Amino acid sequence: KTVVVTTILESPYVMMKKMLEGNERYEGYCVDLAAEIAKHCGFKYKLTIVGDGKYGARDADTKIWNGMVGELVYGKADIAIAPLTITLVREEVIDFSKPFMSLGISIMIKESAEDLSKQTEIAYGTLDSGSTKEFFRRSKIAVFDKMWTYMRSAEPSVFVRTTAEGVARVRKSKGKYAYLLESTMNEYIEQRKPCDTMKVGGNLDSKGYGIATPKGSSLGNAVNLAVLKLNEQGLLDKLKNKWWYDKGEC
Numbered sequence: 001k002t003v004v005v006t007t008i009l010e011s012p013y014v015m016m017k018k019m020l021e022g023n024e025r026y027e028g029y030c031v032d033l034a035a036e037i038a039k040h041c042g043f044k045y046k047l048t049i050v051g052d053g054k055y056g057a058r059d060a061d062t063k064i065w066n067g068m069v070g071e072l073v074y075g076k077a078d079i080a081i082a083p084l085t086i087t088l089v090r091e092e093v094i095d096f097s098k099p100f101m102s103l104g105i106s107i108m109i110k111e112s113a114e115d116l117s118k119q120t121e122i123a124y125g126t127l128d129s130g131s132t133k134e135f136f137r138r139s140k141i142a143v144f145d146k147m148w149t150y151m152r153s154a155e156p157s158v159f160v161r162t163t164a165e166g167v168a169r170v171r172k173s174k175g176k177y178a179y180l181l182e183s184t185m186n187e188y189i190e191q192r193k194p195c196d197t198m199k200v201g202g203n204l205d206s207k208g209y210g211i212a213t214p215k216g217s218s219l220g221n222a223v224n225l226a227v228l229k230l231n232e233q234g235l236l237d238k239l240k241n242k243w244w245y246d247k248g249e250c
């Protein structure tokens with residue numbers, strides 16, 4: 001009937017419009033994408049914000065999945081449309097459509113990862129949780145192994161809790177802090193006032209954001225084909241361009 005869509009607030013994917021109710025209270029790349037996939041797929045839907053404000057990780061002790069991944073695994077939501085990175089750990093428990101947006105871990109400064117690793121004057125870190133932190137923690141690649149060893153025991157802490165906190169840390173560190181985040185957010189922030197941040201070097205890895213459904217869900221096939229069609233039509237490119245550049249401030 002009404003498909004339950006779990007999502008999360010993260011600019012410019014989903015934001016509260018700056019007097020409204022329901023789905024109209026929200027706006028953003030993922031809000032427009034949700035309307036497009038629902039249209040193609042022919043379904044009615046309700047956008048809900050994830051209760052714990054998490055993306056999805058499996059607790060080491062309890063072994064239960066939190067965030068949006070959890071809402072799908074434990075049947076509280078039918079689909080998740082947000083900047084949810086496709087990873088092997090999450091793929092084992094849920095289905096992802098073909099990526100609707102490409103990305104890679106990147107470097108944000110006010111060069112290369114290898115350059116950051118073999119240096120010591122510019123501090124650097126990631127979010128305290130997430131796919132980016134996990135990439136470093138589990139990487140067998142020498143350069144990233146070295147970066148992780150440095151980050152995990154750096155005093156004071158090089159980690160931050162939100163994107164906004166990492167961005168702020170960069171801006172106020174006068175060239176002494178590099179923030180490792182997804183290139184998508186790096187590109188977005190570069191077009192935001194005071195226009196004082198920049199992405200340097202190539203990405204450290206390669207993946208995408210995908211629409212997620214419960215393993216074996218009937219909606220899966222349809223949402224994947226819709227993603228392929230929107231991409232082919234150039235719609236996903238126009239949509240990223242709208243929210244990143246058309247709406248840029250620099």
Ligand SMILES: C=C(C)[C@H]1CN[C@H](C(=O)O)[C@H]1CC(=O)O
Pocket residue numbers: 010055083084085127129130131132133163180181182
């Ligand atoms: C914004 C947050 C916390 C998200 C967005 N995609 C990643 C994820 O799906 O884990 C996280 C960022 C990162 O890990 O650098």
